[PDB]
Paper text:
It is constructed of a lattice of approximately 200 capsid protein (CA) hexamers incorporating CA pentamers at 12 highly curved vertices. The surface of the conical capsid is dense in protein-binding sites that mediate interactions with host machinery necessary for transport of the capsid through the cytoplasm into the nucleus. Here, we present structures at 2.6 to 3.5 Å resolution of CA hexamers and pentamers within in vitro assembled conical CA-IP6 polyhedra from multiple lattice contexts differing in local curvature and geometry, alone or in the presence of Nup153-, CPSF6-, or Sec24C-derived peptides.
To investigate what effect the hexamer–pentamer switch and the tilt switch have on host–protein binding, we next repeated our structural analysis on cores incubated with FG repeat containing peptides Nup153(1407-1429), CPSF6(276-290), and Sec24C(228-242). Within all three hexamer reconstructions, we observe unambiguous density for the corresponding peptides, which adopt structures essentially identical to previously reported crystal structures. FG repeat–containing host factors are diverse in their cellular distribution and function and include: Nup153, a nuclear pore complex component; Sec24C, a member of the COPII complex implicated in intracellular vesicle trafficking; and the nuclear-localized CPSF6 (25, 26). All three proteins insert an FG motif into a pocket between helices 3 and 4 of the CANTD, while residues proximal to the FG repeat bind to CA residues in a cleft formed between the CANTD and the CACTD of the neighboring CA in the hexamer. The FG motifs in Sec24C and CPSF6 adopt a more compact structure and do not interact with these CA residues.
Residue numbers in the entry:
A (entry chain A), C (entry chain A), E (entry chain A), G (entry chain A), H (entry chain A), I (entry chain A): 1 to 87, 96 to 221
B (entry chain B), D (entry chain B), F (entry chain B), J (entry chain B), K (entry chain B), L (entry chain B): 1 to 12
């Protein structure tokens, strides 16, 4: 990250062994379940591109996923170099990725006025690649999630929203899915209660009504 | 592209 | 959180990996038993809305509960936008939730004079949603808690107050419950001792009297 | 509402 | 706790996740064995009332004991409001408990000259309630502790002083108990050696004499 | 009294 | 590492016990699997040559690998002393290795303007030796990696890229390997799908197409 | 401990939860084996009497030993009040023990010029009591330690010096014990080698000579 | 260690509980395997003699080895008092060992200009004694290390260099040992390959050639 | 004496 | 010598 | 060479 030096001006400070051990543990345990993206973004707060690259390099195994990540960052960086023309200099996409700049340039861009926040721009590209990975590691479509005849309605809500969180579809589709699919894919007992409530109920009303049903 | 297939993140 | 910068003025500092690991552990272990709310509020001291959102996003599983939380924050944020008119700007409910503001605006509001404490306002909404969740994860009404004929009176006090802590009812009702239900739902041996004490005894007197009864 | 059903806390 | 800000003047800093995890572990493991009071007081050094309330709220289970604590703090706070008249303002008992004041008022009182040490006053009330709890969780009177015919004299000293530490009685009675009961409740072999030493011996002399007896 | 029976320490 | 002193100027600070314990754990567990190089470089950020030597000396066992490392650093240091002539002084290769300089000279060189970054120069030589070690501890050529008739295409991508990351060959050869060998060494079912896609597909397209094939 | 405040002048800072947990673990595990005294003194560096009392109060169990400690501190404090007359004030023995002074007085005495180092004076009394305890928990006289006919000479040196470290006797006696008893109590094979070396050999010569004997 | 005070000038700061716990763990686990010396020197960076003595006193068990250490420090300190005449004062050998000086004198000597680095001088004597201990705890001469007929050549290199690291002999002898003994003590298959390479090969060439031989 | 038998270290 | 056999490192 | 075979990294 960047922090205030002895002179008060901002300077880089190393990503701690505890943060790296935490990230390594996160990816070793949770294997691109969607909470890995919030955990990455929380662990990587204020990170320079060198800190982001350090986190991603410490990932052991998962090398198919990490190649899907690198080809995404290539696609995002090429889009950046298509978007931004050529005239601190303006960073090229390879500079934002930390591939063609020093760390001193990254401190420069991140501390300029107005800032050129290469740490956040690059973290957006990494998170967009981690998204593509998480949706591919998700084994089921939201269309596949149904409640069993003997399954509690809370364990179906938990499976449904845990799957919905990993869907690609736009927020208009996720809204429609929560309203229509949550009613329709419940088992006939619970679905009868949810049809007696109707389309207008909140998730609290639907869960408290189907409690023990 | 900035990140080649066998290459680590951030390159050399 | 927010902390003093090199210039002495307040600036944001990242929620630590140890705090996030602690929160993840809390929600993984304790599954909205009521102590999760004090633990959340202690772990989230001085948190900006970005820090609060970071804590809630790292919750793996529990996605039915987390949707009950988001619909609560929507209800609280809509009430805020009903309460506060439109004229730092005054934050909208979506700004307090951190959904439509930068972190810089949140530092602005939290360091203004007088403060506009968006971190505490939002933490109130989150805690009010965690309350609704905790009362729903609580499996028994306080009316259901009774002492067994072979059950120690301290293990009944522990079950009773652990249930009472998760009741929705107003403090006037909880007061009446502690006085009347604590006497009435004891087993007939212990209840005989508690009726011999009467309504006026303290919880220490009731427990020391029923000790080994 | 500020927090849509499938959306993470804090939005995009 | 309170600590020096960037301006050098005192300001609040959050009770750390490591301190809260330590306290939660202490109460989960040690269940109001008397060392919980020194551990509480060591973990709670320099605590504001908000920090004390945060520690006590994180206690999971033990809800019978925690109600004995709240009724004690009510009794102590009522005694304070009986003791102190009404004229920073002077804090009411409910303000010292952190129930009717901001944290800013608690920083005010704790940093005033002379200090009004609401953090220590309240920690005295909490420790006095934890005392009442510890004496109730102690299963044996000091009158019940005796040495077995086959029991080493050091394991009886350990049981005796561990019980004596949890007695209510005044220090004059504890002095008399150490002198008279330590001799009288020993098994007849060891008690014969202790009567051959007499009333005047130190605990080192009594233990070294009864060593292997 | 400042701390009611069902109430958390420190109140609301 | 080097950090700002009380006088604001840079001075050395000791490599922490947590960093050394982390490095010892890394080398004890992961035994020169390629992630050991990013972990070394992350743990060794801002390290002086004395800090680098301290990390390498704490490696227990692996003494064949550590001799391959010392003979590499000898080769790199001899190349440096061939490259740089003789005129702070300019550091000799033995000075960059920390073998013939004080730590004060290393602080001198690292804080000079322009810097003479002996910590990074030496970390390059160490990482180049760790590379030679990692490629020797890698048990299989990339030519040996093939998909089994019953093996999922993602577990073959993972084995392939985990092997490719440890190949010596130039990036032109690794590019050719990813394109040609990834298609050719797949099992005939999956290879049929990859030949139906052709040479132009991304790794995401190849994996999603061969999913469950 | 005491540390520099925002004003640079010394002020108290709380003994950390990690230090208290370490001390509790030390006394729970190692039960007054002699290394507990160096561990106490290392953990208690710069401690005020309030910090020392906090460490000793957190000791669970061992209440016979802790009473031997309190009667020692009484004896040392009475000797101090015999030694020092009555004229910051000069601290009485009860003030050095932290029993009759504020912490502010302890900061006063420890920061005065010349210092009145009540933290070290009291730590001497505590360590002198821990010594009496350690010698009583030691189960064997140094006269009892002998080498078995089948016992390696290094495991006898280890038992001998681990016992010698807990002897009461003066350093003149410990010197004589190392010379005479180390030769005399060895088994006849090893003792023959040690008599062939004679009285003048170092412990390295005696161990290397008896190696595998 | 010594660190900058509030006044910017250097002052002592206590060796942390985490460093002491790490050292205790190191000596408990690794029992003077040679990596204990780099671990000691890394954990003891910037240590005063009081910090060094604190580390060595916390060693539980190993009391034969710790006496070999004390007699070494006596020998080194006597050599120092033979080397340095008598005229801050110049420290005597007993002062460098921390046996006859305050900690204030050690801060004095370590912060003087030019420094009198009693912490490093004493750490040299301790490391020279730990060397004598490590060579005695090493169970095999380098002349004893041979490759088995069924033993991989890398597991013989690992045994050989792990033994060589603990040899007393001069670096001229260790050089000759690596060249001549590494070839000669290999099993006849591997030794045939090493004789086909000849004396000139690097350790990488010898290991890659004997790979799977 | 400053430390009575049943009393914690440091007294009240 | 500065460190006697039974004595801890650093003496009294 | 700066690092001899039996020698620790950084030499004496």
């Amino acid at each position: 990250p960047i922090v205030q030096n002895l002179q008060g001006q901002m300077v880089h400070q190393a990503i701690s062994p505890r943060t790296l051990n935490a990230w390594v543990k996160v990816v070793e345990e949770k294997a691109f379940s969607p909470e890995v993206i919030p955990m990455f973004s929380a662990l990587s707060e204020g990170a320079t591109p060198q800190d982001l690259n350090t986190m991603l390099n410490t990932v052991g195994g998962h090398q198919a996923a990490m190649q899907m990540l690198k080809e995404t960052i290539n696609e995002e960086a090429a889009e950046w170099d298509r978007l931004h023309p050529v005239h601190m200099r303006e960073p090229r996409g390879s500079d934002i990725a930390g591939t063609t700049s020093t760390l001193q340039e990254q401190i420069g861009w991140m501390t300029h006025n107005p800032p050129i926040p290469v740490g956040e721009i690059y973290k957006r590209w990494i998170i967009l690649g981690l998204n593509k990975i998480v949706r591919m590691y998700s084994p089921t479509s939201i269309l596949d999630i149904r409640q069993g005849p003997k399954e509690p309605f809370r364990d179906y809500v938990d499976r449904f929203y845990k799957t919905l969180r990993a869907e690609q579809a736009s927020q208009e589709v996720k809204n429609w899915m929560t309203e229509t699919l949550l009613v329709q894919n419940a088992n006939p007992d619970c679905k009868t209660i949810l049809k007696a409530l109707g389309p207008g109920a909140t998730l609290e009303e639907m869960m408290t009504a189907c409690q023990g049903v | 592209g900035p990140l080649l297939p066998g290459q680590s993140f951030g390159g050399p």
